[PDB]
Amino acid sequence: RNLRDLLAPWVPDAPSRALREMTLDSRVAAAGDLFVAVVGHQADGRRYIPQAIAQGVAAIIAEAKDEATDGEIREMHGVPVIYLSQLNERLSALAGRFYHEPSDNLRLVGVTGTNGKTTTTQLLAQWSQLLGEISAVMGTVGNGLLGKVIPGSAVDVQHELAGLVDQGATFCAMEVSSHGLVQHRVAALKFAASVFTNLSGDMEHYEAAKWLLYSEHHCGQAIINADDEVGRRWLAKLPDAVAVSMEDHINPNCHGRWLKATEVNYHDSGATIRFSSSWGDGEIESHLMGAFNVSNLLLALATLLALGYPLADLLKTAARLQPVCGRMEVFTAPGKPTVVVDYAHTPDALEKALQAARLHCAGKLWCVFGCGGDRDKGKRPLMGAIAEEFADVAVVTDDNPRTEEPRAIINDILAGMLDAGHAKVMEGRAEAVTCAVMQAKENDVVLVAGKGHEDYQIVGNQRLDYSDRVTVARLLGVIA
Ligand SMILES: Cn1cc(Cl)c(C(=O)NC2CCCC2)n1
Numbered sequence: 251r252n253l254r255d256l257l258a259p260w261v262p263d264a265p266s267r268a269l270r271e272m273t274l275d276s277r278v279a280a281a282g283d284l285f286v287a288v289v290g291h292q293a294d295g296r297r298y299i300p301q302a303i304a305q306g307v308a309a310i311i312a313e314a315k316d317e318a319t320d321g322e323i324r325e326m327h328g329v330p331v332i333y334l335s336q337l338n339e340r341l342s343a344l345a346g347r348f349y350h351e352p353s354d355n356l357r358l359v360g361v362t363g364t365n366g367k368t369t370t371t372q373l374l375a376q377w378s379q380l381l382g383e384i385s386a387v388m389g390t391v392g393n394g395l396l397g398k399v400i401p402g403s404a405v406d407v408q409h410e411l412a413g414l415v416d417q418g419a420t421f422c423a424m425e426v427s428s429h430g431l432v433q434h435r436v437a438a439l440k441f442a443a444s445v446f447t448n449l450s451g452d453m454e455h456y457e458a459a460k461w462l463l464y465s466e467h468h469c470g471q472a473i474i475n476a477d478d479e480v481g482r483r484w485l486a487k488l489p490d491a492v493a494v495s496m497e498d499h500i501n502p503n504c505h506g507r508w509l510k511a512t513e514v515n516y517h518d519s520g521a522t523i524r525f526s527s528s529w530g531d532g533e534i535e536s537h538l539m540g541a542f543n544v545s546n547l548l549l550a551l552a553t554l555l556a557l558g559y560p561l562a563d564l565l566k567t568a569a570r571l572q573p574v575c576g577r578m579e580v581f582t583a584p585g586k587p588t589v590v591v592d593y594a595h596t597p598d599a600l601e602k603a604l605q606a607a608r609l610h611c612a613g614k615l616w617c618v619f620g621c622g623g624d625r626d627k628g629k630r631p632l633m634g635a636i637a638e639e640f641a642d643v644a645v646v647t648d649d650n651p652r653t654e655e656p657r658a659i660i661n662d663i664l665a666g667m668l669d670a671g672h673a674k675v676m677e678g679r680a681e682a683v684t685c686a687v688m689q690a691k692e693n694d695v696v697l698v699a700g701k702g703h704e705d706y707q708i709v710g711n712q713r714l715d716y717s718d719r720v721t722v723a724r725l726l727g728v729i730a
Contacts, residue, residue: 276298634667
């Protein structure tokens with residue numbers, strides 16, 4: 251890594267210096283590093299130029315605004331300080347070149363939208379890896395190769411993706427936040443494909459801003475949910491985009507590429523998805539629950555088809571797609587009720603989970619849940635209300651009561667119900683789960699909400715070892 255090489259595309263006669271790492275933070279700027287002095291959140295990194303020089307950085311690239319001309323080469327205490335106008339915009343490109351263009355050395359897929367980003371990301375990474383890729387994800391959960399994921403500027407994005415390339419990643423599924431897009435955090439990334447899940451006088455400027463940004467990015471293949479209203483607005487202007495639907499929104503007059511679920515059967519262990527596409531028709535057996543997750547799976551399918559993965563191979567491997575751990579995660583066993591573990595711990599999330607669960611439920615829908623102690627009490631009656639309305643049987647129990655009287659939390663939940671008396675109450679979460687699962691009929695569904703993947707119950711100050719997943723698994727006679 252050389253300052254001259256790094257800046258060649260922009261600054262013709264830049265000094266030759268060996269560079270170690272690239273950083274925005276003067277406090278971690280070691281000897282040999284490239285320090286990047288940016289202006290932003292009422293904060294100016296050019297303040298910390300002498301600090302960095304004193305800490306022995308090899309060179310500095312700084313914002314030119316008010317201080318210098320674009321590409322102006324100065325030197326301070328033997329250290330090259332090079333000024334670039336609108337450095338915030340160019341940071342991704344700068345970092346990209348520094349880290350040897352990671353997105354040009356793997357198949358990168360960006361997923362944007364409000365919901366389904368994490369699930370769609372994980373499905374893409376999974377399915378691609380099942381077809382021979384070494385796949386990775388970068389998202390809200392975290393970054394890493396599939397299985398080794400662990401918990402943010404334009405430089406960090408390029409640097410992390412470079413790390414995944416070094417680890418042998420050939421495919422990466424990236425969650426692209428709306429916020430990050432507006433702040434040029436992915437401005438210079440070569441996306442093989444961009445996916446849109448959903449959105450949930452003014453409308454003109456918002457759309458204009460988004461359209462403007464789109465034209466500035468290398469989005470690659472566009473894969474869009476046509477069941478979303480903004481999705482169809484995108485599709486109207488993008489004749490090469492792939493339209494995906496499960497609610498009869500493909501308009502075949504356009505003669506574009508498409509994928510639509512024709513019929514879907516939500517059953518006790520997942521969904522059977524019959525679909526047609528411009529790549530051909532087929533039937534997928536998904537082990538994921540709810541309509542939203544069919545949509546996510548169809549988006550991932552359409553995306554991989556668009557990138558040239560063969561339909562027959564994707565079909566062969568579809569059954570092996572798993573859900574995100576503790577996200578509408580189904581547990582079935584011969585002759586026993588279906589049990590779904592979900593982390594839903596807010597009113598809206600609980601409602602979604604129950605509505606999702608209902609689709610797979612021939613018999614009665616049971617909801618086992620509680621609320622956290624020593625936390626905002628406002629949600630408690632709201633979650634009670636939702637449990638009452640959208641489930642047939644509400645089993646109110648404990649969920650991290652902490653120092654707060656467990657029964658006090660339950661009472662707050664019950665307060666929200668029209669008919670608290672028809673709710674079952676059982677303290678001991680384990681016992682309550684056991685109660686729902688044991689009493690439920692074969693064609694019933696038990697949603698165990700609130701914890702999902704978490705493997706602890708906080709009673710008092712103790713963090714006791716407990717898992718919904720393990721409890722459910724033992725009762726059903728399977729492994730979590
Ligand atoms: C600026 N930019 C980068 C990405 Cl990625 C997107 C995006 O939102 N793409 C979705 C709408 C058009 C196709 C899918 N926009």
